[PDB]
Amino acid sequence: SELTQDPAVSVALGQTVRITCQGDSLRSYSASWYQQKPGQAPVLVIFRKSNRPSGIPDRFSGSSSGNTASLTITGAQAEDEADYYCNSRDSSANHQVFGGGTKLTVLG
Amino acid sequence: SELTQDPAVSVALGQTVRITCQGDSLRSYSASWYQQKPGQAPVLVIFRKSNRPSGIPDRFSGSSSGNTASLTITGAQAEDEADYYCNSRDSSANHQVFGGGTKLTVLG
Ligand SMILES: [Cl-]
Ligand code: NA
Ligand code: NA
Ligand code: NA
Ligand SMILES: [Zn+2]
Ligand SMILES: [Zn+2]
Ligand SMILES: [Zn+2]
Ligand SMILES: [Zn+2]
Ligand SMILES: [Zn+2]
Ligand SMILES: [Zn+2]
Ligand SMILES: [Zn+2]
Q: Is residue B3 within a helix (H) or strand (E), and if so which, with residue range?
């Protein structure tokens, strides 16, 4: 399996941004989403399509439809500037596949 | 790439336990380790062989040797009872490979 996402997007403070991932695995398997900030370990912000791990703000939401999955940030904050990666189970047992990441810039 | 780990081990409160993963990827790429508790998202306890994410207790440590990687918990506490999964970059671009997991039972 393979996944594709746009390499970069911006959002203004307080606006909404949607980051989408596409690939065949997404018809079968739920997407998860990682946030990567400089000097930190990656953080799961969404898993199993739309569930938020403990402590993740509700301004992060996930959805899917068909061969696409999306991460939406509603009311973007300065701290949300990060690289975001979609992932899912891969066709190979015990493997996961990732998108190439989307760099989010938050302006204002 | 593929990774193997023993399915189960135990540790007494206050003792040390080492969970080991084996596979060819580990000679060249660093392992990460996830803790999985029921009803929660997976939590990265070690990444990039030996680094601990923010907030993870220093009783968790990681190492590697040859085609193996190890998670050691020194001074196990009751809350450490969980499933632990090793992972690494896979031979396929943008893929990760995982072991099958090790169920850790903490006794006492
Ligand atoms: Cl500790
Ligand atoms: Na997390
Ligand atoms: Na984490
Ligand atoms: Na127990
Ligand atoms: Zn694949
Ligand atoms: Zn391809
Ligand atoms: Zn297709
Ligand atoms: Zn900036
Ligand atoms: Zn593989
Ligand atoms: Zn095989
Ligand atoms: Zn400590």
A: none
How was this structure determined? It was done by X-ray
Whether residues B95 and A94 touch (CB distance < 8 A) is answered with no
Residue A56 Cα to ligand 9 midpoint, Å, equals 31
- Chain A: closest CA distance from residue B69 (Å): 17
CA separation for the pair B1, B24 (Å, rounded): 7
Q: Using H for helix, E for strand and C for coil, what is the string for A2-61? A: CCEECCEEEEECCCEEEEEEECHHHHCCCCEEEEECCCCCCEEEEECCCECCCCCCCCEE
| Cβ-based contacts of B40 with chain A (< 8 Å) | 53-54
- Which CATH code fits A1-108? 2.60.40.10
Q: Which runs of E-coded beta strand occur in B2-108?
A: 4-5, 8-12, 16-22, 32-36, 43-46, 60-65, 68-74, 82-89, 95-98, 102-107
CA distance A21 to A44: 16
Resolution in A: 1.4
Nearest CA in chain A to B1: A95
Max Cα distance, chain A (Å): 44
* Residue B1 near residue B96 (C-beta atoms within 8 A): no
Cα nearest neighbour of B91 on chain A: A95
